[PDB]
Design an enzyme around this catalytic site. Sequence first.
Site, PDB file in Angstrom:
ATOM      1  CG  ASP A  39      -2.093  -0.892   0.935  1.00 45.64           C
ATOM      2  OD1 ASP A  39      -2.095  -1.899   0.374  1.00 45.64           O
ATOM      3  OD2 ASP A  39      -3.215  -0.460   1.319  1.00 45.64           O
ATOM      4  CD  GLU A 260      -9.319  -2.657   0.677  1.00 40.08           C
ATOM      5  OE1 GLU A 260      -8.077  -2.328   0.620  1.00 40.08           O
ATOM      6  OE2 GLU A 260      -9.779  -3.739   0.661  1.00 40.08           O
TER       7      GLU A 260
HETATM    8  O1  LIG Z   1      -3.496  -2.420   5.809  1.00 35.05           O
HETATM    9  C1  LIG Z   1      -4.519  -1.468   5.744  1.00 35.05           C
HETATM   10  C2  LIG Z   1      -4.320  -1.001   4.078  1.00 35.05           C
HETATM   11  O2  LIG Z   1      -4.836  -2.309   3.238  1.00 35.05           O
HETATM   12  C3  LIG Z   1      -5.871  -1.956   2.378  1.00 35.05           C
HETATM   13  C4  LIG Z   1      -5.364  -2.191   0.989  1.00 35.05           C
HETATM   14  O3  LIG Z   1      -4.512  -3.568   0.923  1.00 35.05           O
HETATM   15  O4  LIG Z   1      -7.034  -3.105   2.798  1.00 35.05           O
HETATM   16  C5  LIG Z   1      -6.659  -4.319   3.158  1.00 35.05           C
HETATM   17  O5  LIG Z   1      -6.752  -4.420   4.553  1.00 35.05           O
HETATM   18  C6  LIG Z   1      -8.022  -4.159   5.148  1.00 35.05           C
HETATM   19  C7  LIG Z   1      -7.843  -4.080   6.756  1.00 35.05           C
HETATM   20  O6  LIG Z   1      -7.312  -5.413   7.170  1.00 35.05           O
HETATM   21  C8  LIG Z   1      -9.089  -5.170   4.591  1.00 35.05           C
HETATM   22  O7  LIG Z   1     -10.188  -4.461   5.246  1.00 35.05           O
HETATM   23  C9  LIG Z   1      -9.157  -5.026   3.149  1.00 35.05           C
HETATM   24  O8  LIG Z   1      -9.972  -6.323   2.731  1.00 35.05           O
HETATM   25  C10 LIG Z   1      -7.598  -5.165   2.492  1.00 35.05           C
HETATM   26  O9  LIG Z   1      -7.695  -4.834   1.211  1.00 35.05           O
HETATM   27  C11 LIG Z   1      -6.369  -0.586   2.524  1.00 35.05           C
HETATM   28  O10 LIG Z   1      -7.745  -0.568   2.618  1.00 35.05           O
HETATM   29  C12 LIG Z   1      -5.690  -0.198   3.762  1.00 35.05           C
HETATM   30  O11 LIG Z   1      -5.110   1.357   3.628  1.00 35.05           O
END
Ligand SMILES: OC[C@H]1O[C@@](CO)(O[C@H]2O[C@H](CO)[C@@H](O)[C@H](O)[C@H]2O)[C@@H](O)[C@@H]1O
Length: 405
Positions: A39, A260
């Site tokens: 990310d 996201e």
């Molecule tokens: O770690 C948070 C970060 O990861 C993102 C994108 O990869 O979301 C991921 O993690 C979330 C929390 O565990 C999950 O809800 C989601 O399914 C997963 O894609 C971003 O949204 C965030 O900034």
Amino acid sequence: ATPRWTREHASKIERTDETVVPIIYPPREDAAPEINGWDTWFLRERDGSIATVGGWRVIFSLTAPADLLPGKRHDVAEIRYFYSRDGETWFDGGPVFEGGTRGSRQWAGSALLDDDGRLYVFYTASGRAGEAEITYEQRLAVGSGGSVVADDDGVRIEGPFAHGVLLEPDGERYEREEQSRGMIYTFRDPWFFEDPRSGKTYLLFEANTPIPEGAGACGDPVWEEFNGSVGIAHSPTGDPTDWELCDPLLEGICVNQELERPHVVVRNGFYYLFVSSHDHTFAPGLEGPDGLYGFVADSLRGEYRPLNGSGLVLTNPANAPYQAYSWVAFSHREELLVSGFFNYYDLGGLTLDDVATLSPDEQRAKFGGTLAPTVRVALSGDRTRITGTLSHGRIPLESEELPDL
Ligand SMILES: OC[C@H]1O[C@@](CO)(O[C@H]2O[C@H](CO)[C@@H](O)[C@H](O)[C@H]2O)[C@@H](O)[C@@H]1O
């Protein structure tokens, strides 16, 4: 009258030559063997162009120790910054924050080097600092008042950091943790954006739009649990720390729970809105892959319509379907470049839940934890096409010429 990504759209989702990225192979060495990184977002100037300080670009990544299990990295995520002169060879700058960071851990956001030279690092405060058991409470926060110093030797982010919550969900336009039906609510990924037309200052984020029980807001009560949305806030003053909630840009109600890392690329006269989404976050009756989905309108707050009819812009091949995620699109001259991170490979068929079964060693080493080869795409109105790729995590400036096709 909020623009909606409909089930009629999602029904048409389908891998095509124009949306499928090549196979991602691990890079020859790791920039930090000790750290897994995902990310990732860019230090931008106010207009949104990649910021350049003394010839250096700066990027930010969510990071965890490499020896830690991939599935658990989200519980201990820490923001590190990296700097590069060329766009390929990144140097680890270490953690961005030395002090009172908000939340038990920090999730993705954005970075602004204002005209006045002040640094704002927008992030998601997940949980509360020093909580007993991990909570999934998400609030849009900022680490303001940073200084970015660049010598010919590297880049240090110095000075005292001032940490404050910017936004928490209202309860009417954006779903709160209390209101959360089905899967865990979303209120994260704050992305700073100045509208090049209006000059007005906005902050995009991922949220959920609340749907009352028995609302009949959907053709099936269970579908209404999937109420993913791209929220936006406005700063009347243009101060990057003063925000008022606006109506959401786009809703995926009855389609997907997680829209996201939302972000806008403005190209010629059009606003392209991009969101990363999972296959597991799709409402029942719908089958879509882990991918970057995209919409286009003539205005920032306009009637968004899905790219390529279905909304699917970019996805992984069938035989490596989780190899990349968390894509960020950005303009380079006449191309669109897209940088995700290298996620899960060599599964041999296994689903994500199945990965958790494997030995710690077998789980690490099925996880990249680096930048994916940045994809070159061409936009053509409401239609997109993959044109090629660059080296792993190459983030070039508009001043730099890319290889020919
Ligand atoms: O770690 C948070 C970060 O990861 C993102 C994108 O990869 O979301 C991921 O993690 C979330 C929390 O565990 C999950 O809800 C989601 O399914 C997963 O894609 C971003 O949204 C965030 O900034």
